[PDB]
Subunit: 283 residues, 4 copies
């Protein structure tokens, strides 16, 4: 599978969205699993999940790697509401357009926020819920905020450079040897190709600060079976939030990977794939 061979576009129409272009990468034909990416400069579905798409398709799922609004090849947008919710509206728009009744969701960081908001807003449209270090769940009991990684994410949005990108990826990943030229060049291309996304993200963030994303009080509404993953060494979203989700969601479990930053699906892809596929099949 390649980005090119799996690349698709769909126009969505949900609430605020009118004829809004969503890019996604699709493979497989079984039960639908929609995978949702983080909010860093240059993020997108394919780059975030390229180590996961194959095994999930092999396991028999239909995998959709979605570009959230204002990222990668989806349309540009300035958001005045918290991104988790707006993003979830876009997932519903995509599912309606593609005639998908229910989907399992997988989301890291911003994508975890998207997935939480979707489960809250459209409980009849979700299967299982897989969350990797979801962002926006209020203060940490231990970590000073903004987190180290979030400071770098804002620095790169405001003053994009290849050097600052490398600095951000060094904080993002636990194992520095994973930062190949291929990874760097790829993310840098996505940043260079869509400068408007960077500008728009910063305007959006002013309009709706991270505090507005906090859906903690509503977590008791979630009836989806939930699998929470965390990197032990995540410098972007605090580990204690894994506990917050575990205590507040009715049917959840928590898996923490050692030697792992904020990209567990990439850093620990084999174990992540096995655990999540097992969860989807058997939980």
């Amino acid at each position: 599978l390649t980005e090119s061979s799996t690349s698709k576009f769909v126009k969505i129409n949900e609430k605020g969205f009118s004829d809004f272009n969503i890019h996604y990468n699709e493979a497989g034909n079984g039960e639908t699993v929609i995978m949702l990416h983080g909010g860093g400069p240059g993020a997108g579905g394919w780059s975030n999940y390229y180590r996961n798409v194959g095994p999930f398709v092999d396991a028999g799922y239909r995998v959709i790697l979605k570009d959230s609004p204002g990222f990668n090849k989806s349309d540009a947008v300035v958001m005045d509401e918290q991104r988790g919710l707006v993003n979830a509206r876009a997932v519903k728009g995509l599912m309606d357009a593609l005639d998908i009744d229910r989907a399992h969701l997988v989301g890291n960081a911003m994508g975890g926020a998207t997935a939480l908001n979707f489960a809250l807003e459209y409980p009849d449209r979700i299967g299982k819920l897989i969350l990797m270090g979801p962002g926006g769940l209020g203060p940490s009991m231990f970590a000073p905020m903004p987190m180290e990684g979030i400071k770098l994410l804002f620095k790169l949005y405001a003053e994009p450079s290849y050097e600052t990108l490398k600095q951000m990826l060094q904080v993002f990943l636990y194992d520095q040897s994973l930062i190949t030229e291929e990874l760097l060049q790829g993310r840098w291309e996505a940043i260079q190709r869509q400068p408007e996304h960077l500008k728009n993200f910063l305007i959006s963030a002013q309009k709706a600060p991270l505090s507005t994303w906090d859906v903690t009080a509503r977590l008791g509404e979630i009836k989806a079976k939930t699998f929470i993953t965390w990197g032990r060494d995540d410098r972007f979203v605090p580990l204690d939030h894994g506990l917050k989700l575990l205590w507040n969601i009715d049917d959840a479990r928590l898996h923490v990977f050692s030697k792992c930053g904020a990209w567990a699906q990439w850093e620990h892809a084999d174990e992540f794939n096995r655990l999540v596929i097992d969860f989807l099949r058997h939980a």
Copy 2:
């Protein structure tokens, strides 16, 4: 499989042990997995692991449910050293007697301490290491100690009664509906059948308090791939110790079950069996 059909005895000779009788329950014939039980009155291998033995044997392992010294049908003993270490010596004694070169270990609570000590003392004799809420790892950063459950364990040792046993099991398990008459009668029979074990446990505990069990400082020596499990609702061994192990053992992961006390292998048997079998096969 039944307790009777799987029941075996072996005399061990390791360090302090001379012609010491160890009872165990064995089934299967593949790679050896030795499962080690907790330290509560009436504990033993079969009762602790009866929901696990079948699936592990089905998966192709040789399962040995070991009775630790001073429990169930193994010989009575008064220990002057911390039980984790003495217990680990007994595992080695059993393996030598049965000509087993390496074993995967599974242990909860006291059995987790046994398994940690074994990995430390005999690193050439262990495969993978599976730890469920291991006891004795020093103070908690959050929980007042002695833990609520430990107070009840000592109360039942000192003044055994069916009522106090039920009180202890109510704290041990998250879901109260799991406390059937079968469970209660079974544990009560093991308590009634070996009063000497109760007396000896209390003498042992005076000679080597829980502080003596703390092997935290040596955790960096462990080279075994390690899978740590915890019940979110464990009132016997504090949840933050799962983090302690995750930060201090080189290659570990942590899985926390929601709605789960100190007997995760029984309370969440299906998920526990699937996760641990996957770990043994693929990690």
Copy 3:
């Protein structure tokens, strides 16, 4: 100072309360400090704060040790709303009746909940806010709930006995040598003298479970300078809630006493008195 010499009654009329009798103990004539007690059987203002009233009066404060509705010598009541809020309404009723414009509040456990609700509902009527292990702030990130101490508090409400009272106090206090016959007999007398309070508490608790008390989401509204204290060894209200308050209230500090249960003002009276008086004078 004695209970008898300081004993007063005042009828209150606030919202739901009509000609409702509130008992309190008053001494001193400076700035008013209202001290609010916990929710255990037999609790009351004088017994909870008798080691604190003298030093605060010596420091120049007017101290009011208030009996909350449904405790000690205040009127009996069945509450259908969370007690923190109803209790706070009663504090306002008392202050209005006594022509007190602003008060500093001190409250432990249930009384901490009362004080938080008061600061939220009547921000113009509070000076400084002193909180000792306040109850009802939602789940713990570490402690299984209901807490060990809360289980015993409900057991004593339902089946009052001198033995169960002693068991509860053993969990309440860190240092067992503090449990004198005087303490036990005193609390037992308050329990024996007002059986209706026990019955009513249990009815109230069914109508408004501890979850209803959770004001976490509103903590950002508190503008009062806040001093949070915790016992390291509190088995009634979880230590991590001290962190929750510290991160969520604008101007707070946290002081944790070692070797201390849920009655820090009594167990560590000298240090508590010095710290809180310094805070009132200088913060």
Copy 4:
């Protein structure tokens, strides 16, 4: 009081030290309080404690602001052992040279490590122990390590610049408005004046990594009354280590300041001074 008027030098001779020059700033004549600084580039006694020296002297103490070996105006040194211990040896050397029998110690970060090692090695020579976010106490249960601030401290040691110094101070302090030109120019002068200290620090750190500083296992030996302070927002030394000390030292208390980085004695000087003076007088 000024740096110049209080400036003194003393040659020390303790274990490895031979005629080793120690610089310190002294004022007052009562009970001796030795204050010990952190390990950042350009750190020293006067700059670290200039908001504290006056009030402590006013309270009646003899205050010695000590420059640790390899900092500020003390002699250059390459250390092959953990700095906490070597530093503590230097404190003893100073006390012996000045005929001081016992001292109260105050230390932040590296200085907290110095003070812990001193209490362990010379328990007959310490009064009370005041610890502000002491460094080197092993892994955090929550924070990825090396901490954000420690990364910047090493960056500034290796590539000193005014810009990198400002970046470090921005992480060091919670309130950015405290970073005046006076603060920056002062620290920069100390860095420019002693380049050899920077080079030597980096050589020392290679010889004895932060892991070597971990004295956790010995904390039970400390008999000194101990006051632990932490900044809620400390990005250099993890907040949970305040809990570690509180559970492991016999007679400790913990005070956490909100809106506070790694320099609590400067960021919250008034409250810090009041609390520590009260502790020295009355605990």
